[PDB]
Motif scaffolding. Structure first.
Motif, PDB file in Angstrom:
ATOM      1  N   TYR B  18       1.031  -1.195   0.202  1.00  0.00           N
ATOM      2  CA  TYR B  18      -0.114   0.053   0.285  1.00  0.00           C
ATOM      3  C   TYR B  18       0.809   1.116   0.152  1.00  0.00           C
ATOM      4  CZ  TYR B  18      -3.693  -2.648   1.309  1.00  0.00           C
ATOM      5  OH  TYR B  18      -5.120  -4.075   0.719  1.00  0.00           O
ATOM      6  N   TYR B  22      -1.280   6.073  -1.717  1.00  0.00           N
ATOM      7  CA  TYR B  22      -0.691   7.974  -0.985  1.00  0.00           C
ATOM      8  C   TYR B  22       0.607   8.015  -2.137  1.00  0.00           C
ATOM      9  CZ  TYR B  22       2.203   5.101   2.098  1.00  0.00           C
ATOM     10  OH  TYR B  22       3.002   4.432   3.350  1.00  0.00           O
ATOM     11  N   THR B  29      -8.439  12.111  -5.382  1.00  0.00           N
ATOM     12  CA  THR B  29      -9.545  12.269  -4.913  1.00  0.00           C
ATOM     13  C   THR B  29      -9.354  11.224  -3.604  1.00  0.00           C
ATOM     14  OG1 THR B  29     -10.847  12.615  -7.344  1.00  0.00           O
ATOM     15  CG2 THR B  29     -12.481  12.322  -5.221  1.00  0.00           C
ATOM     16  N   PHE B  30      -8.696  11.250  -3.294  1.00  0.00           N
ATOM     17  CA  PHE B  30      -8.285  10.230  -2.282  1.00  0.00           C
ATOM     18  C   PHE B  30      -8.822  10.872  -0.760  1.00  0.00           C
ATOM     19  CE2 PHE B  30      -5.348   7.107   0.520  1.00  0.00           C
ATOM     20  CZ  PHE B  30      -4.950   5.716  -0.886  1.00  0.00           C
ATOM     21  N   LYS B  31      -9.762  10.912  -0.725  1.00  0.00           N
ATOM     22  CA  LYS B  31     -10.281  10.879   0.630  1.00  0.00           C
ATOM     23  C   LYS B  31     -11.596   9.930   0.748  1.00  0.00           C
ATOM     24  CE  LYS B  31     -14.256  13.077  -0.092  1.00  0.00           C
ATOM     25  NZ  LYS B  31     -15.994  12.761  -0.187  1.00  0.00           N
ATOM     26  N   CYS B  32     -11.668  10.046   2.234  1.00  0.00           N
ATOM     27  CA  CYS B  32     -12.434   8.428   2.530  1.00  0.00           C
ATOM     28  C   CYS B  32     -12.644   8.407   3.729  1.00  0.00           C
ATOM     29  CB  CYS B  32     -11.588   6.781   2.106  1.00  0.00           C
ATOM     30  SG  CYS B  32      -9.729   6.841   2.529  1.00  0.00           S
ATOM     31  N   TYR B  33     -13.148   7.846   4.295  1.00  0.00           N
ATOM     32  CA  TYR B  33     -13.878   7.988   6.085  1.00  0.00           C
ATOM     33  C   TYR B  33     -13.964   6.964   6.210  1.00  0.00           C
ATOM     34  CZ  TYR B  33     -16.162  12.022   4.871  1.00  0.00           C
ATOM     35  OH  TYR B  33     -15.936  13.940   4.282  1.00  0.00           O
ATOM     36  N   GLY B  34     -12.789   6.211   7.422  1.00  0.00           N
ATOM     37  CA  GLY B  34     -12.813   5.110   8.341  1.00  0.00           C
ATOM     38  C   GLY B  34     -10.963   5.259   9.000  1.00  0.00           C
ATOM     39  N   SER B  36      -7.743   5.761   9.727  1.00  0.00           N
ATOM     40  CA  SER B  36      -6.486   6.625   9.411  1.00  0.00           C
ATOM     41  C   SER B  36      -5.718   6.381   7.802  1.00  0.00           C
ATOM     42  CB  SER B  36      -5.288   7.009   9.908  1.00  0.00           C
ATOM     43  OG  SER B  36      -6.004   6.865  11.489  1.00  0.00           O
ATOM     44  N   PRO B  37      -5.155   7.733   7.196  1.00  0.00           N
ATOM     45  CA  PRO B  37      -5.010   7.242   5.833  1.00  0.00           C
ATOM     46  C   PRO B  37      -3.856   7.163   5.298  1.00  0.00           C
ATOM     47  CG  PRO B  37      -6.307   9.176   5.646  1.00  0.00           C
ATOM     48  CD  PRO B  37      -6.101   8.469   7.330  1.00  0.00           C
TER      49      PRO B  37
END
Lengths: 43, 50
Positions: B18, B22, B29-34, B36-37
């Protein structure tokens, strides 16, 4: 998922399916994903 | 496949790679909820689907 099991134990019956007990252990699992309805065998 | 018949793929047992996600400049558009990125290599989810 595609699971495969096999035993390969010797027997003594040819006239029909032999009467006995033997568990089957898994061999390999394939994570592919596909709708299936039929199948065929190849000699 | 088009969105009407959305296709899926579950990731089997493999070491997560992974760090190249990043770091990619093609993404915008690397926005997400959950989770930590940033702690992506410290996650141990049972199964992941794409």
């Amino acid at each position: 998922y595609f699971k495969i099991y096999s035993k390969h134990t010797p027997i003594n019956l040819v006239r029909d399916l032999p009467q006995g007990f033997s568990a089957l252990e898994p061999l390999v699992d394939l994570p592919i994903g596909i709708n299936i309805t039929r199948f065929q065998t190849l000699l | 496949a088009s969105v009407y018949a959305w296709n899926r793929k579950r990731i089997s047992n493999c070491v997560a790679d992974y760090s190249v996600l990043y770091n990619s400049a093609s993404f915008s558009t690397f926005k997400c909820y959950g989770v930590s990125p940033t702690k992506l290599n410290d996650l141990c989810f049972t199964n992941v689907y794409a």
